[PDB]
């Protein structure tokens, strides 16, 4: 269902869905199983590009999140048209050796040609087996 994230841009992200999680309740990402994540956002600008930047933290310490496809245009219709709504469906496979944790803050910023497209932080992810 719909999950709660905190916006770090200008409210362009409208809804964020993770299968089988709800609101601000713990959302369990399983190691070694694909993680899927849908978003509904409004393009704040014309852009031919969309770059994903992830910073994530595990129990307060920064972590390099690997095997992330930075091109969001692989997961939505690009080019982007200013003022139109888009539906991105991103899929990232959690590596088996991904470290388990009950405290996980993830920041995702998407850059376009003319500036930040969208930004959100999520605090409720938990990594388990």
């Amino acid at each position, epitope marked *: 269902d719909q999950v709660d994230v*905190k*916006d*770090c*841009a*200008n*409210h*362009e992200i409208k809804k964020v869905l993770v299968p089988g999680c709800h609101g601000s309740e713990p959302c369990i990402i399983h190691r070694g199983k694909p993680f899927q994540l849908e978003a509904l956002f409004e393009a*704040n*600008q*014309n*852009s031919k590009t969309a770059k994903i930047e992830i910073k994530a933290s595990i129990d307060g310490l920064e972590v390099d999140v690997p095997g992330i496809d930075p091109n969001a245009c692989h997961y939505m219709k690009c080019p982007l048209v*200013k003022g139109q709504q888009y539906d991105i469906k991103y899929t990232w496979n959690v590596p088996k050796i991904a470290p388990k944790s009950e405290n996980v803050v993830v920041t995702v910023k998407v850059m376009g*040609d*003319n*500036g*930040v*497209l969208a*930004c959100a932080i999520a605090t409720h992810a938990k990594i388990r087996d």
Partner: antibody, heavy 123, light 107 residues
């Protein structure tokens, strides 16, 4: 309800320094980026600096780059602008302005502005 | 940084429609807003996203951003509309403000 109150301007010699505060009230300060916009006497608006809600993203104008630094204290609900090595052309009234979001994007707009405080730099 | 050019002044008769223009190399790729600064007061937003008017701002105010030119349109200009008008747009992280168009109503 939403209010910003500036202070710290003054007569300063070239090369002098000032610290500007902007004291906010009536909104969750930390949820919103706040920016400085200056205006020389009888002239137009010039953007100076901005800062995301978390204090993460400092951005400056090439004109002020290197001599000004922007900062927040969220507990105190206050935005600061430390101006050093000031120059005459930096003489103007300095407004702080709340954005509509946490971060500067193309859609962002300045929805609230203080009454301003006046900086004058002269020999 | 990119530059937004506005006419230096626009004079209008009471009840005439004023038309302030703001031009930039690629502005239809971005959003343009408009601020009104009456003498001795702080700026106030009147149009926020090309064609969007804040609740509170009078219905007479309208906007557009077609052709790489943003256009504020005050219909039925009154003596209250008599102020300096500044367009604004983002050069990524930099807020670019226009030169300024002083609207006078000949009353």
């Amino acid at each position: 309800e939403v209010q910003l109150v500036e202070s710290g301007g003054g007569l300063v010699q070239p090369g002098g320094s000032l610290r500007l505060s902007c004291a906010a009230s009536g909104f969750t300060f930390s949820s919103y980026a706040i920016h400085w916009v200056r205006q020389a006497p009888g002239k137009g608006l010039e953007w100076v600096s901005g800062l995301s809600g978390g204090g993460g993203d400092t951005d400056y104008a090439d004109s002020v780059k290197g001599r000004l630094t922007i900062s927040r204290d969220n507990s105190k609900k206050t935005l600061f602008l430390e101006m050093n090595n000031l120059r005459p052309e930096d003489t103007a009234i300095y407004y702080c302005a709340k954005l509509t979001g946490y971060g500067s994007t193309p859609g962002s707009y300045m929805d609230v502005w203080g009454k301003g405080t006046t900086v004058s730099v002269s020999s | 940084s990119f530059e937004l050019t506005q006419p230096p002044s626009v004079s209008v008769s009471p009840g005439q429609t004023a038309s302030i223009t703001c031009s930039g190399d690629k502005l239809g790729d971005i959003y343009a807003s408009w601020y009104q600064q009456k003498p001795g007061q702080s700026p106030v937003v009147v149009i926020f996203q090309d064609n969007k008017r804040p609740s509170g701002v009078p219905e007479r105010f309208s906007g557009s951003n077609s052709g790489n030119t943003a256009t504020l349109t005050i219909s039925g200009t009154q003596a209250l509309d008599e102020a300096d008008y500044y367009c604004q747009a983002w050069d990524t992280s930099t807020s670019v403000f226009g030169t300024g168009t002083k609207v006078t109503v000949l009353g």
